[PDB]
RNA sequence: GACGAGCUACCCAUGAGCAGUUUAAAAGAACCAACUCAUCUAUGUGGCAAAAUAGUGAGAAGACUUGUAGGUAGAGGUGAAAAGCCUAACGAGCCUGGUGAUAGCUGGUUGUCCGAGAAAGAAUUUUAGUUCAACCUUAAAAAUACCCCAAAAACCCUAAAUUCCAAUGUAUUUUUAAGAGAUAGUCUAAAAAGGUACAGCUUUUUAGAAACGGAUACAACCUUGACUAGAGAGUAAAUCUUAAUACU
RNA sequence: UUUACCAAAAACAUCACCUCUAGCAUUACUAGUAUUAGAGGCAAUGCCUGCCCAGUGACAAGUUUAACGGCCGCGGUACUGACCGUGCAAAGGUAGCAUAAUCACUUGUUCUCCAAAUAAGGACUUGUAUGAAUGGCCACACGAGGGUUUUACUGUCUCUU
RNA sequence: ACUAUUCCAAAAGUUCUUAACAUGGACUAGCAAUUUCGGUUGGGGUGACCUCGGAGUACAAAAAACCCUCCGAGUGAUUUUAAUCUAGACAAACCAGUCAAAAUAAUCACUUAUUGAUCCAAAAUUUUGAUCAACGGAACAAGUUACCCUAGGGAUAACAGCGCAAUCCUGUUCUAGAGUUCCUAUCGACAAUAGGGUUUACGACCUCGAUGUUGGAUCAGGACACCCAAAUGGUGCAGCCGCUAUUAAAGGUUCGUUUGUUCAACGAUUAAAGUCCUACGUGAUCUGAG
């Protein structure tokens, strides 16, 4: 009996998208925080956005997650319109990641007393 | 249609770029690129 | 192995049958 | 690389047989012996015999049978092609070398007693195999390891639950140096697929198990984890029960 | 004539008929010389042997099938189709024979044969997968070949002694 | 290689030739050599697929199978030519993949997929080369074997057993309907619920250091879902035949023509010429037509 199943190429590995660090994790500058294919979490304070929508930590610190108000860039039109048609009482919210800096910025050392 | 690999030549020195071009030739290839030796912005000309 | 829903009435694991006989009305 | 045509295939020499009967006849004619074959049946099957015996059959002056002696030799010979025959196994002889050929494939692998102990993620002319990872064993160095309350992880609907962490209960875990085996699993509960809401069915994910005690019997279900002695004790799972009536 | 030791046949050979290839001397052929000698095909005899050089060959572009091999549609019309149209081919399967030692349907149809026959023989017959030297068709004479009937005979068997 | 062919050199001579030997390099054939004939697979063959990405399966960190269910890619379209060098990271068997601060001076097409490792080749100053698509890629190899051979496997088929019961097979439950009227004498659509384990399948669980496989012969053991004989209910049963249903397994259940045939047709009869199971009973009893 002809057993042809017409479907092809279901097979891909998973991309291991997801959250790499968790709230209250210590982080060094450069660590990737989470990696996603669509924006699930947006970059907050001290979190840089990679061209593939990676989130990495800019400072040395503690990673925090947050629900905050979303005010799209006036250059990006779709989001501008989505913001436009809302009923007059409602604001948009999203989830952000943050780094909270640990090390102080610097120190004043006494080099020489002349 | 096809894709042609073309080798660009800089005005000055031995700097050589390699890039791809279109069969239909939408935009003929002439570039402003970066030369390492003089550390400059250059005019690169399409060659073979 | 038999599916979660079946028509042949599906014999229960013994520990669960005891569980049944204990909780009767 | 030797040795084999004393069997058999075909030739070359040199010899030898063929009675009777019928027909003008030695005519690949009749009939029927010797002689040659091997049809059909039954015996026989470690036989009388590594192919026979008894009956019964075909041919029987011819492409006939048969004796002695030569010849052709294996990448070959010979063949009225059956891929036949070439010394009791010929789709390619036998022997001695190469030769302890080579077998991811079977089959075997020898004293005692103790420690610790494994179930399949990748690639692969790969799925009967290897080589990496993970687990693990033997040494070493160290510091935290499991457990883990808030807090936290998405946008329409979305259960059991995960991930991540102090306290706390414990002693485990990570690195370094050496190593292998293993990588052909079964069922039971749960979530799903495929099939017939079928399999002692197949395909993944999460758990369990493989008692000398129970379920008589029993691999996977249930009770228990472990040593050596006692003609002591307490317990565990478990022994199998349940039923059903009138209309005036 | 053959599978010594599971197959003697329808297989092979063979008279006959045809294709090729050869113009010549010391060891074969051959002490031969084209009416001869080598490679082969197909199997006497009788009647026959249709059309096809486009492919692959082979020969010395062209030529060849008694070389390897091939030898049709689709619809319209007097239930049928002599006719008709158009397409493709190198040609379009003819003479025969036919349910067959011929894919299947399939135990084709019908007659004869028996009390009864999926057997046997005779016919019809598109065999859509027969068919003419990979030979087609009839016929003597011959088979330890296969099948069918009859006579006769009997322990095959009724059914054993 | 050889046997032949054709040619060019060589060799001899002529001013272009080849008598027989005979070497170098070609050519064109015959005879002939050497080596292979990928893999997944609900046995193998035929069919289909082999890398890469989106969904589902896999519901909320990751991962996650099938010859699972569905859509895609082996590139286009531009302009703005999208640079060096180095912290820390994701991912990961490995190989490949990914982000990226500081320091110097690409976009749209669901956007995610648009791609091939070494070696070896060509190139210039530096780099380009594959339906290597069997897509971790052998520099280049197909058919057959019933003439077959070895090593293995019940890790895997054919026979038989077992599992399951789709199909098949016996019951009942429901009355629309047939039955002129009348559901249930005899039946009965659409449907419900139990069973049986012979069929064709489906699984691959025992056997491949052999469980010898169809039909007959002989001899039968068993079931009862009775074909006869024996008791009975109902009838659209007057009687004769009948048609249905209940109870009953001690005993029976023919001889022929054609087929290897069980089946089936057909002749002739019988009280009847049952349906089955037993390794489709029975080959260390027989027969091999198949
Ligand atoms: Mg997927
Ligand atoms: Mg995958
Ligand atoms: Mg290219
Ligand atoms: Mg001799
Ligand atoms: Mg001799
Ligand atoms: Mg005589
Ligand atoms: Mg004679
Ligand atoms: Mg006798
Ligand atoms: Mg005689
Ligand atoms: Mg005679
Ligand atoms: Mg002979
Ligand atoms: Mg032959
Ligand atoms: Mg043969
Ligand atoms: Mg011998
Ligand atoms: Mg060895
Ligand atoms: Mg390979
Ligand atoms: Mg292997
Ligand atoms: Mg912790
Ligand atoms: Mg297995
Ligand atoms: Mg393995
Ligand atoms: Mg069971
Ligand atoms: Mg497990
Ligand atoms: Mg016991
Ligand atoms: Mg103890
Ligand atoms: Mg003989
Ligand atoms: Mg013989
Ligand atoms: Mg014989
Ligand atoms: Mg003949
Ligand atoms: Mg002539
Ligand atoms: Mg003739
Ligand atoms: Mg002709
Ligand atoms: Mg005709
Ligand atoms: Mg026929
Ligand atoms: Mg024909
Ligand atoms: Mg011919
Ligand atoms: Mg023919
Ligand atoms: Mg004659
Ligand atoms: Mg004869
Ligand atoms: Mg005869
Ligand atoms: Mg060699
Ligand atoms: Mg293959
Ligand atoms: Mg295979
Ligand atoms: Mg298959
Ligand atoms: Mg199977
Ligand atoms: Mg195929
Ligand atoms: Mg910068
Ligand atoms: Mg290349
Ligand atoms: Mg491969
Ligand atoms: Mg591969
Ligand atoms: Mg890969
Ligand atoms: Mg044969
Ligand atoms: Mg063998
Ligand atoms: Mg098995
Ligand atoms: Mg059997
Ligand atoms: Mg079976
Ligand atoms: Mg058995
Ligand atoms: Mg059942
Ligand atoms: Mg089934
Ligand atoms: Mg299995
Ligand atoms: Mg076996
Ligand atoms: Mg044995
Ligand atoms: Mg009996
Ligand atoms: Mg009864
Ligand atoms: Mg009886
Ligand atoms: Mg039997
Ligand atoms: Mg039998
Ligand atoms: Mg027996």
Automatic annotation (TrEMBL), chain A:
Keyword list, A-Z: Mitochondrion, Ribonucleoprotein, Ribosomal protein, Transit peptide
GO (cellular component) term, any one: mitochondrial inner membrane
Keyword Phosphoprotein part of the UniProt annotation: no
Residues of the full protein shown: 35 to 148 of 148
GO BP term, pick one: translation
Source organism (scientific name): Sus scrofa (Pig)
Domain of life: Eukaryota
Family, similarity comment: Belongs to the bacterial ribosomal protein bL27 family.
Molecular function via GO: structural constituent of ribosome
Protein name: Large ribosomal subunit protein bL27m
Protein localization: Mitochondrion
UniProtKB/TrEMBL annotation, chain C:
Coiled-coil residues: none
Location(s) in or outside the cell: Mitochondrion
Domain of life of the source: Eukaryota
Similarity remark: Belongs to the universal ribosomal protein uL10 family.
Name of protein: Large ribosomal subunit protein uL10m
